[PDB]
Amino acid sequence: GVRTSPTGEKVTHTGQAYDDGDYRRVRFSDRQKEVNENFAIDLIAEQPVSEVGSRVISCDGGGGALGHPRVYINLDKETKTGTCGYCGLQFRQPHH
Amino acid sequence: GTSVKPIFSRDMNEAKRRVRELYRAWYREVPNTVHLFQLDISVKQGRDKVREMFMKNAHVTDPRVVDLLVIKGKMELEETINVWKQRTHIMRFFHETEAPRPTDFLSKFYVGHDP
């Protein structure tokens, strides 16, 4: 999700962009500013919400021992979704 | 009493005699150092630097400290005479590439926070 700045400089996922006044932009002359193209926030926002039939669900990130430590998520709040603190995947209970 | 043992000297007089002997050796050596290392300084500059190095710790009143200082001076003289030292080591005594650091309050206030 790269957007350009008024000076034409690409904006990183962290949000750092040099100001017009700043002299440090000279380091990119005749060269390029390295920016990763895959914003992880937009990618994780694209994942669908899982629906499960229990008050507590477990997430390990997938792949067993190739994921993150296994944690358990409470799903009692009806007007929200439980989010894994490692992976960012969302879970909920079937409503309406 | 304080029950302390010496290194070489018993009181300050013997220590001063050793200091004078070391000073004589360094003063004799300076012209040969200027010749062998191909220094662009004069012999007068070298002898002034030797005198300044000696005067840098003229305030010592402990004969043991003076004894150790004389031992270190002899070590440095042995390094210089045998050419273990290089031209850069000899010229480090003069600090030729260091910009002067001002000592009055106003300049220190202008440049930075250091006291």
């Binding site: 962290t14 949000g15 750092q16 380091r27 990119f28 005749d30 060269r31 390029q32 500013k33 390295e34 | -």
Partner: protein, 144 residues
């Protein structure tokens, strides 16, 4: 058995498509061995194997003559090998990417880039954090 060796040399000449291909492979790679083709890249690199050779010479790559933007007829380097063929070529696995393809991901590069040091595409480092201390902005209107 000398005639056998000489005939082997003549079939090495013939197996590179004739004298032109033989000389091209002799001047590009300094080697005229004929191997079995394992596969080809989308960049043009070709990969060969010959298990009768000893360990280290039993696999090799003939680099492409044109990668992303530069003429690589003479100027080649090991950084032109894509990661899957990189894993096969360094003998970290026995299965080539043709028989054993890697997992497909939306974020994996679809176009491999070689070492771009010394070019306008070279990486230039910079601080990725924002400003720490915000200054006070004086008012734009007079005071008297």
């Amino acid at each position: 058995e000398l005639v056998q060796v000489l005939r082997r040399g003549l079939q090495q000449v013939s197996g590179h498509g004739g004298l032109r291909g033989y000389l091209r492979v002799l001047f590009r790679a300094n080697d005229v061995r004929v191997g079995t083709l394992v596969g080809e890249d989308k960049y043009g690199n070709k990969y060969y194997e010959d298990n009768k050779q000893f360990f280290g010479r039993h696999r090799w790559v003939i680099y492409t003559t044109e990668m992303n933007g530069r003429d690589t007829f003479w100027d080649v380097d090991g950084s032109m090998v894509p990661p899957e063929w990189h894993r096969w070529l360094h003998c970290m696995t026995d299965d080539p990417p043709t028989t054993k393809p890697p997992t497909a991901r939306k974020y994996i590069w679809t176009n491999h880039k070689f070492n771009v040091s010394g070019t306008p595409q070279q990486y230039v480092p910079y601080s990725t954090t924002r400003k720490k201390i915000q200054e006070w902005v004086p008012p734009s209107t007079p005071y008297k």
